[PDB]
Amino acid sequence: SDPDPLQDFCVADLDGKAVSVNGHTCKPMSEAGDDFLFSSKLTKAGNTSTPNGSAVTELDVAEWPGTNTLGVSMNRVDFAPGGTNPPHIHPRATEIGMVMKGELLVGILGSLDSGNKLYSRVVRAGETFVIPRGLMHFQFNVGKTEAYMVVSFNSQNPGIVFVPLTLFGSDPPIPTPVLTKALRVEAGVVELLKSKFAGGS
Amino acid sequence: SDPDPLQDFCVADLDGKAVSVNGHTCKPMSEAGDDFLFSSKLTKAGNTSTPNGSAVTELDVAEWPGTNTLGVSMNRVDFAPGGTNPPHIHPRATEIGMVMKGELLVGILGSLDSGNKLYSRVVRAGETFVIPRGLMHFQFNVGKTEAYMVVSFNSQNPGIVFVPLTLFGSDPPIPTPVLTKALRVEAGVVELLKSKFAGGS
Amino acid sequence: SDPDPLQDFCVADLDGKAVSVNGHTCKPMSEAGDDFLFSSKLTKAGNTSTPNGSAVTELDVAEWPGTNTLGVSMNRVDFAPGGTNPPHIHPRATEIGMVMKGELLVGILGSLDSGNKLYSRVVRAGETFVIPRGLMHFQFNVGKTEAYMVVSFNSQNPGIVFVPLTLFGSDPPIPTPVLTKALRVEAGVVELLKSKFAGGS
Amino acid sequence: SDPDPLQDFCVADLDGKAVSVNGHTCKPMSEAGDDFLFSSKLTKAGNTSTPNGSAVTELDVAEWPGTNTLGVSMNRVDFAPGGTNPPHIHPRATEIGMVMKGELLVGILGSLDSGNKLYSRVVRAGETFVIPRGLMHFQFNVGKTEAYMVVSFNSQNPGIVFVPLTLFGSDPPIPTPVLTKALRVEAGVVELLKSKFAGGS
Amino acid sequence: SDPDPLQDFCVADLDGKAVSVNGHTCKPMSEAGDDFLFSSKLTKAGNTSTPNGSAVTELDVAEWPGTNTLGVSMNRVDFAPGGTNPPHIHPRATEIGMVMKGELLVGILGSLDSGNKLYSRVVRAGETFVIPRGLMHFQFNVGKTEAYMVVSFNSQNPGIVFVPLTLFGSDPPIPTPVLTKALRVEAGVVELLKSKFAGGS
Amino acid sequence: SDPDPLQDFCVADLDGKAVSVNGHTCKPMSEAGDDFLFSSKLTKAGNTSTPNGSAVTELDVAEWPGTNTLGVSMNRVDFAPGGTNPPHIHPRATEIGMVMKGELLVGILGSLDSGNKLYSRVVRAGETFVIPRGLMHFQFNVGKTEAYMVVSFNSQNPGIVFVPLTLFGSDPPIPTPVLTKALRVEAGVVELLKSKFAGGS
Numbered sequence A, B, C, D, E, F: 001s002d003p004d005p006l007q008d009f010c011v012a013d014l015d016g017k018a019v020s021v022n023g024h025t026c027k028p029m030s031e032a033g034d035d036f037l038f039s040s041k042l043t044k045a046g047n048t049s050t051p052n053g054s055a056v057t058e059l060d061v062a063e064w065p066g067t068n069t070l071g072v073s074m075n076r077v078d079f080a081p082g083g084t085n086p087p088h089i090h091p092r093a094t095e096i097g098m099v100m101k102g103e104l105l106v107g108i109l110g111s112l113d114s115g116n117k118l119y120s121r122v123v124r125a126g127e128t129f130v131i132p133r134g135l136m137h138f139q140f141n142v143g144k145t146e147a148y149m150v151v152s153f154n155s156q157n158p159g160i161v162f163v164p165l166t167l168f169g170s171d172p173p174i175p176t177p178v179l180t181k182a183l184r185v186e187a188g189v190v191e192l193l194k195s196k197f198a199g200g201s
């Protein structure tokens, strides 16, 4: 997991000209102010009018620099009815979350050794779920109303590997011959899938 | 922080006769069932009719054995008007939280090297705070209504060191001459404070 | 990464009745024998007559119990001409590898913050590649001959999340409405893809 | 615990104008000299004429920059007769110590899960004690003569949270209404306690 | 470094029949007693009438089971005049030490990247030294009186690799042709050196 | 082990004027290029005409800057007939390797607690070995032809402590009186050994 802190506070210096290190260099304490341990960025619902039908409002170290070195971060996800936060992976964190409003099918997938078992249930207000580091998982709004959840991670920068978008719309895309062999379907089907992710989102 | 996991899942075997190790031994996967990644324990408010005027509903590994090895846990805290979750420390985790309802003064205290500086603000619905591992902190309900928050930790078992309860109601209590020297007051004041925590809570 | 060792040696006790812990309990040293630090399991090529056109011969802790607690493991992958080791993720390890024979296209994909960039090149005998923990990656045999590679991980049990198999052949499968929303195609296309992975491999 | 080192030596560059990171940037080896692995700062007794009746002579990374990245530090504590090193916490390290001269009552307090149990004994010359990371603990000189101890930590910068001083004399102090609720006594008692710590030490 | 603890206390169960794990299984708290955080084993000087002319009194987890999971241990080393604690390595810990009596030459050796540089000085009462994890180091009594030091490690079980004993008195010994090639001397010189360590100490 | 990464990529900035930190500062991604995850430095055999009769071709972070933060590295070792990679230690990594050509005696030595036990066998093409962090080990070419192996480490910078060279040819060398006491032979023998390593290699 994230390296442990070596002092009380180390607010990320996010200036583009700052020297680059594992994580982020820190602001001198004299420039950190009094409010760095606090945020209000998650008070408002994200706009769910996206191809997925969900919106992620991130509160990683880039959005909450006071989390730098502390080994944690958060985000909020809002869902239109029938919207999905599609199969995805966090390369560097386990996730722990609570549904705040609505009804969300939450699915978590074991690795090959676990027989690729799918664990899932419809999670409602006040109910929680946990997703081990690096495993594929998703959420899907099964209700008629807008739903949302708030989640936390044991990393300042968990990362997100969106499976459909990286499989079909990476920069540049994976060669079609690789995907026809891997997906066991003809080039026409692979190209149809590529066509849906051509815009980079 | 918590040791990283060495497999996908390892549900804590909480049987009193189980061999003891750092953390917990695990249930065989055949006996884990399908629901271990999920909990509903935080759906209901805790009873705030306590001396503190708050109630902690824990979702550590003891209450959510599916978190075993995963490096995370949660809890919920409810507050009566004027209620406090008193100055306390988590010995083994950073805390990251969101106020869900009401108005909570949240205070976070730096160590000696940070000049014992107090960082505080009134945190309202949807707003968040972060508490570095091992630092003293508190919450206080400054509103007229009941308030609650939901918090996460980067440990399955963060621990709680309540400052007033530990100082005055440890088992056995700290000798009075130690406390008179440390607190710079007469024995009468120390014995008064001890009398308020004589039940171990 | 994997927890550090707390003694010189701790050979995994792989008996089905052994108590379960994070990782594995260990054989008493009296029963470990003299050969546990050594293996010959990767001397022979795997059978590439598979749908993928590749074969993985694993040398994780299950196959090499002497690696228990040591923070490392290996495997070998053999490829038929035109064969793929399909897009996949290791949830708990960085991978570092060398191509031993043939010509392999090796592709490594950044996360969302890296713009889902695809880094790739054709890697030949004696040439090497490195794959950060949790990132999607693949290999494809672009040569006319059989190819093979030998790779190492900074975990005793890196895990493997095969993207096509997990998306379409999980147990149970991900519901079709989740996949139609995520993949931006009709149910017919999703059910076609499911049919190709219906045997769980 | 502290992040592991990534090279042999990395002497802290403690210049006030140096870029800030988790821990400290390092001096080039050409500027480190030949003596960085050694210190003589603990050869002399600290002056015990302080309100606590003890003096801490620190040998953390700020005083011994050669410890940077190495995951260890030390200090010496001297005690007047009847003097205390008051209830305190190290947020980022376990402590391991030896009494060198005199008779010191050493007390270590479990967390809530341990029933806030107090473990204690009078520790004499050559005898040792260990204090788990983040737990409240104290020392008290029960002898008629000056006493001292030398302790080590598994961090370059363990930190110190002095319980009485941060509870009553933080910058700014915790609001009195918070403390009356938490300590279960009247405002007059809280103000008396505050008055003893008003100077910041 | 050592895995972090997942609870307050976990006293090593050192029974020969206990299940084996990374580190040690733990005594139930009901059986731990009240004294596990304390030791008196280092109060007395070791017998320096040895070939080395020094004696190590160990306080690792085997001798102080209360250190289990806590990431620390200690030992004491006593020296006859002209005695050595010979060139050695700790495979799993940084060492931090203080000379308590006498005059000890302490030498610390950089790795190949550090040009195998030897850092050394004569360390006297109250003076300290630090040895990075895995590096070769030694002590030698240059005084006319008996000397002793007390050292701490950031591991419960640092391990000791004695260079002369391992090179010449391993069980079984390293083959003579390996040592003649490595040491650049004839078989006669190697067999002479082997003869000095033929008892395994 | 090496601190975990806090982002996808962080290519080492190896400019001599760069600020120094634990590990290495990183190049901005705009300057990293497209090829940093790949190397061809191990395609060619090293020249085995050295006193040891072996050559190490390193692929640590200094030679493969793309490994920075990723917790892995590699090297290749080539052996003349009768050549040795002499008893040595990696202070910061376990090693996992495969013999590619020839016949190599591979020896691994336990610490004092393991009775300084020597584990060894002749390892041939495709066969593997594992060496726990910090333990002394060697390889010796028992065949009539040139042999080679390729190994990986769970560190970007494992380090190398060559036992004969640091014992006898450090900068400056260990004083002869220390070595006569430690090795249990006369000064003449110690000086003969020193004479073989006087050139610093």
Ligand SMILES: *[C@@H]1O[C@H](CO)[C@@H](O)[C@H](O)[C@H]1NC(C)=O
Binding pocket: A047, A048, A049
């Ligand atoms: C999202 O924002 C767009 C652009 O402002 C707007 O047209 C749309 O109605 C919004 N959707 C929702 C669900 O609020």
Ligand SMILES: *[C@@H]1O[C@H](CO)[C@@H](O)[C@H](O)[C@H]1NC(C)=O
Binding pocket: B047, B048, B049
């Ligand atoms: C809350 O606790 C108080 C005091 O113990 C008790 O009188 C009351 O019955 C409790 N309320 C509920 C709803 O159980």
Ligand SMILES: *[C@@H]1O[C@H](CO)[C@@H](O)[C@H](O)[C@H]1NC(C)=O
Binding pocket: C047, C048, C049
């Ligand atoms: C390889 O696998 C195929 C398909 O299962 C099988 O027909 C063939 O016998 C296998 N080859 C060997 C050498 O076992």
Ligand SMILES: *[C@@H]1O[C@H](CO)[C@@H](O)[C@H](O)[C@H]1NC(C)=O
Binding pocket: D047, D048, D049
């Ligand atoms: C400590 O120092 C002060 C100021 O120099 C001095 O007056 C006092 O006597 C000293 N106390 C002791 C115990 O040495």
Ligand SMILES: *[C@@H]1O[C@H](CO)[C@@H](O)[C@H](O)[C@H]1NC(C)=O
Binding pocket: E047, E048, E049
């Ligand atoms: C110290 O060891 C020597 C050699 O084994 C022995 O003769 C002597 O009795 C020992 N001294 C004590 C005090 O036990």
Ligand SMILES: *[C@@H]1O[C@H](CO)[C@@H](O)[C@H](O)[C@H]1NC(C)=O
Binding pocket: F047, F048, F049
């Ligand atoms: C190694 O290189 C040297 C110098 O170029 C050469 O003389 C020697 O023959 C080479 N040895 C081998 C075994 O290639």
Ligand SMILES: [Mn+2]
Binding pocket: A088, A090, A095, A131, A137
């Ligand atoms: Mn997620």
Ligand SMILES: [Mn+2]
Binding pocket: B088, B090, B095, B131, B137
């Ligand atoms: Mn808290």
Ligand SMILES: [Mn+2]
Binding pocket: C088, C090, C095, C131, C137
């Ligand atoms: Mn892979």
Ligand SMILES: [Mn+2]
Binding pocket: D088, D090, D095, D131, D137
């Ligand atoms: Mn302390």
Ligand SMILES: [Mn+2]
Binding pocket: E088, E090, E095, E131, E137
């Ligand atoms: Mn040592």
Ligand SMILES: [Mn+2]
Binding pocket: F088, F090, F095, F131, F137
């Ligand atoms: Mn090696």
